[PDB]
Design a protein around this ligand. Structure first.
Ligand SMILES: *Cc1c(COP(=O)(O)O)cnc(C)c1O
Length: 402
């Protein structure tokens, strides 16, 4: 099992919907990854902020092993003993009345849109099937037909058939645009990411989230905050929106909600929106299973108990300050919050972000390019200062070797 054979096996038998970086990973622990050759790598992608707590965190692994021997799935046709405990825990932690559990982020987004439409028809009084949902340009919340229907990325939706009606798109970080869009009374919700991760970690101006909250409240529009990637202490707070002390109507969570051990996602909102969905009107087979509930409880407990948010804040300050010392000769921009950061490099004929990531892999650091000039830096939140500093040294060497 060399790296080449693993690549060839995936190429021969698997679909070609991805072009991963040529690394064949076989072990993971905390912040480190090991390939089949035994090489050691710094993980600076964190599986898209899903292993914020580190790879194979002992407390989450123990919870999964304890639950797997007793009960893993009953389906929602009956009750299990774990779901209610997790629901109470999460609802108290994030200060919302109810949580609707799902498995993946796309499912939470679909649930959020369904909630928005049902609330618009039943509570707001919009005439049926005229309800609109507004999204921000550069948004990403998955690859379902509805999700790509709201994407501004041509690779996401080009050639994928007719698209879901009722979706409007406005520029990100543009309060006047949202105000103008909300003049349509048929708007039911505005869905937005506090920081657009897939777009290249674009950070809105301070006060943007406050303005969005005020505009949504003024025009009775549901504020949907997609914190699947930004939430759970990655940006330095429990939710990135806590930076502006803003309370969205709906909160989406996922990925790091399980520490990478299980597909678990959640839709958090109060009774006045959640109870528009009557029994038998929405659900999922694996949504709310006891195994995922135990895993999510363990994952959130290690986040709270290890103060990963505060460490993320301090270490992100250091990371951005060090990355800004990089010459504008190569690094055109540095941006981010907490340990969700990105650098935009000057792409030329000589080099691009793909080559930078290849050389970073050669030097023991794993990162992925998302635009051809944008490189993501997102190590697990359990990093210590010295590990971060030596990772920064690796990044400096790779950058200044071109
Ligand atoms: C990752 C992502 C999703 C989709 O999550 P999946 O589990 O891959 O379906 C949704 N919203 C945001 C902001 C994301 O980063």
């Amino acid at each position: 099992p060399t790296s080449d054979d693993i690549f060839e096996r995936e190429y021969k038998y698997g679909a070609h919907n991805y072009h991963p970086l040529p690394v064949a990973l076989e072990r993971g622990k905390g912040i480190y990854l090991w390939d089949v050759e035994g090489r050691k790598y710094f993980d600076f992608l964190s599986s898209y902020s899903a292993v914020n707590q580190g790879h194979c965190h002992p407390k989450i692994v123990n919870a999964l092993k304890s639950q797997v021997d007793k009960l893993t799935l009953t389906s929602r046709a009956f009750y299990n003993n774990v779901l209610g405990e997790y629901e109470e825990y999460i609802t108290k932690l994030f200060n919302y009345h109810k949580v609707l559990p799902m498995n993946t982020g796309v499912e939470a987004g679909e649930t959020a849109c369904k909630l928005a439409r049902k609330w618009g028809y039943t509570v707001k009084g919009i005439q049926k099937y005229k309800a609109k949902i507004v999204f921000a340009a550069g948004n990403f919340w998955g690859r379902t037909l509805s999700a790509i229907s709201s994407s501004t990325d041509p690779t996401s939706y080009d050639g994928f058939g007719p698209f879901m009606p009722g979706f409007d798109i406005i520029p990100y970080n543009d309060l006047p645009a949202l105000e103008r869009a909300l003049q349509d009374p048929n708007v039911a919700a505005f869905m937005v990411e506090p920081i657009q991760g897939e777009a290249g970690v674009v950070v809105p101006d301070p006060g943007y989230l406050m303005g969005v909250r005020e505009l949504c409240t003024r025009h009775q529009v549901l504020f949907i905050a997609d914190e699947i990637q930004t939430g759970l202490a990655r940006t330095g707070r429990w939710l990135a929106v806590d930076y502006e002390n803003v309370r969205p109507d709906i909160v989406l969570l996922g990925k790091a909600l399980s520490g990478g051990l299980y597909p678990v996602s959640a839709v958090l909102c109060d009774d006045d929106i959640m109870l528009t969905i009557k029994p038998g009107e929405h659900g999922s087979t694996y949504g709310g299973n006891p195994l995922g509930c135990r895993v999510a409880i363990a994952a959130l407990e290690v986040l709270e108990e290890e103060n990963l948010a505060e460490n993320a804040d301090k270490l992100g300050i250091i990371l951005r300050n060090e990355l800004m010392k990089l010459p504008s000769d190569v690094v055109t921009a540095v941006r981010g919050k907490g340990l969700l950061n990105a650098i935009v490099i000057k792409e030329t004929k000589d080099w691009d972000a793909w080559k930078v990531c290849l050389r970073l892999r050669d030097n023991g650091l794993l990162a992925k390019p998302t635009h051809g000039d944008i490189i993501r830096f997102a190590p697990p939140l359990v990093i210590k200062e010295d590990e971060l500093r030596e990772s920064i040294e690796i990044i400096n060497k790779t950058i200044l070797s071109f």
